[PDB]
Amino acid sequence: KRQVASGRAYIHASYNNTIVTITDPDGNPITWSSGGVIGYKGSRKGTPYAAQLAALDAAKKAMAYGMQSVDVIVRGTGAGREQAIRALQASGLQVKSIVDDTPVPHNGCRPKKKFRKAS
């Protein structure tokens, strides 16, 4: 449809869930894939294998729309960062730029209970 043949990939890597969103150069999202899309449930959504499957799925639906090369822009510290990177780099995309872009607070709001006891 868009046939821009080049977008960007935002990989939201959480401990519980892994989401990948492919967007146009402008930043408007083109398509998104999750762990629930594959139908996987419970704790095992954080398993690397599920993230691999989501990544491949997103790649296929992307090539469906004319994609060739993207910029991977990884976010968060999910259990499946590097594996999804490896999957998508060799998924058939001519990926140009990969950058870690984890949004860390500059010591702002006070975190929840389990994130306390800081050193």
């Binding site: 690397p48 294998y49 691999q52 594996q83 490896r86």
Partner: protein
């Protein structure tokens, strides 16, 4: 073991052909101490291959064995109540062990009635590059290099 690395026994070279691999194969065939029966069954296989194929048997033994030599195995690892089937590389000793084992067990499960007949067809088929032993060899082969993500667990 814990202290030893364990030394491997050296099999006595065959009487007829003057080789050890035949001895190992017949030993794998050998059950209940019936070494005479196993040897005769093997020699009947030798006669079958010699009659049905012009070439000398021994070359075929080696090349078929190679045609049933696994080269990439999967090993179980216990990480935090989870299983990691890491693909590793096998030793030549391990290669031959699994080779002989798989060949023999494949030979035994053939539809034919006579042992010599079964083992003969099995070894010829393994020679050509297609058979139960071969099939399972590539089975475990393709099972490996599939868990490459789990390849960083060096076991």
């Amino acid at each position: 073991a814990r202290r030893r690395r364990a030394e491997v026994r050296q099999l006595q070279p065959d009487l007829v052909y003057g080789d050890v691999l035949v001895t190992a194969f017949i030993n794998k065939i050998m059950r209940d101490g019936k070494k005479n029966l196993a040897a005769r069954i093997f020699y009947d296989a030798c006669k079958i291959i010699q009659e049905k194929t012009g070439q000398e048997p021994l070359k075929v033994f080696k090349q078929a064995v190679e045609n049933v030599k696994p080269r990439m195995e999967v090993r179980s690892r216990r990480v935090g109540g989870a299983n990691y089937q890491v693909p590793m590389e096998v030793s030549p000793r391990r290669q031959q062990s699994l080779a002989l084992r798989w060949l023999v067990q494949a030979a035994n499960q053939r539809p034919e009635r006579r042992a010599a007949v079964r083992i003969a067809h099995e070894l010829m088929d393994a020679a050509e590059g297609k058979g139960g032993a071969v099939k399972k060899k590539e089975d475990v082969e393709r099972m490996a290099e599939a868990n490459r993500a789990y390849a960083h667990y060096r076991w």
